Amino acid sequence: SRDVAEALRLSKDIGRLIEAVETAVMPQWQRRELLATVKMLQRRANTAIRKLQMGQAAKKTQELLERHSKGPLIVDTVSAESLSVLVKVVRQLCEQAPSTSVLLLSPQPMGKVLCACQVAQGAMPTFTAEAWALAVCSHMGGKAWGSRVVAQGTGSTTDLEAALSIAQTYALSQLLEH
């Protein structure tokens, strides 16, 4: 968590350095030389950040797998620092569980909650992820956006159990048809 934040901060500081070099007073050839080195640093930093996130997403999906069976549906709570990380967890879980539909909520301080969901390919085209996240998040007073296969949303509540119960009812209503 903190390690990821520091990594992110490092990148931001670097980004700040590129702008300082771009707007700096110096000969242009010199500017070009320093900018090339700085951009490369930025790339390394960005990759490091990506590696850290991907890894912590991997930790989570695995913990989740212990918690659940590779069933038709996974509805659960995970701690996620960012929406991007949570979305990654959903994608990995769905890579590892090809026949499962997934919706996850991550509690945030200030009573803010994020949602990401994905629908398995095997599942019927009628079942859509956007409406799934919209029912869950709209119950939490937020909003949702996405496509038929995947969607994301945000809401604000401390009653997570109610939202999870709606998430499962909505899914099972679509999954158990015929």
Q: Write the CA distances from 35 to 25, 44, 89, 128, integer angstroms.
A: 13, 14, 35, 46
The secondary structure element, H or E, covering residue 51 is helix 28-67
Cβ proximity of 78 and 56 under 8 Å: no
Assign 67 to helix, strand or coil: helix
Encoded amino acid at 34, one letter: L
What is the SS3 assignment for 112?
Answer: strand
CB neighbours of 161 closer than 8 A, spacing ≥ 6? none
Report the structure determination method: X-ray
**What resolution does the deposited structure have, in angstroms?**
2.3
Three-state DSSP class for residue 58: helix
H or E element, residue 121 = none
Q: Where are the domains of the chain?
A: 1-178
